[PDB]
């Protein structure tokens, strides 16, 4: 509870600082740039992705293989920051779809699959291409 109170102060102040162009932490800055890019990605390409997530027919029994097939094809011929943004947006859209269909159990599974793919298959590229700090400079 003491730790939760600390996190609440940190979240509140990080938000208030960012509202005025200041940054609580590098992690706060990466999170913010990722939220902004995800919003801008969905703003520009919403119509192009209409129905495409619905068309995957998400079920608890098929979600994992559908997730892997998508991400393996997305990064099949390499990585760039825009495809990483597309990857996060895809995961968020898949989560919203799960709750909409009353498959809330998928949210925590999807979050784990994303972290696993990020840790094992995107981090090597990220380390080679400037780290998340370079993402913030190009997208923040």
């Amino acid at each position: 509870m003491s730790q939760s109170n600390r996190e609440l102060v940190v979240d509140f102040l990080s938000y208030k600082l960012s509202q005025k162009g200041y940054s609580w932490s590098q992690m706060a800055a990466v999170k913010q740039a990722l939220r902004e890019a995800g919003d801008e990605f969905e703003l520009r390409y919403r119509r192009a992705f209409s129905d495409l997530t619905s068309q995957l027919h998400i079920t608890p029994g098929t979600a994992y293989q559908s997730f892997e097939q998508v991400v393996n094809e997305l990064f099949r011929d390499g990585v760039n920051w825009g495809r990483i943004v597309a990857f996060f947006s895809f995961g968020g859209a898949l989560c919203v779809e799960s709750v909409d269909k009353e498959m809330q159990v998928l949210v925590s599974r999807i979050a784990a699959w994303m972290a696993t793919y990020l840790n094992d298959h995107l981090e090597p590229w990220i380390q080679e291409n400037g780290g998340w700090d370079t993402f913030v400079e190009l997208y923040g």
Binding site: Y45, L56, Q69, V70, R76, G82, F90
Partner: peptide, 21 residues
């Protein structure tokens, strides 16, 4: 024409267009 591949190839294209801007 598999739904997974269709969304993934749109993610890739759009991703690459986004990357370029």
């Amino acid at each position: 024409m598999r739904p997974e591949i269709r969304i993934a190839q749109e993610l890739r294209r759009x991703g690459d267009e986004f990357n370029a801007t």
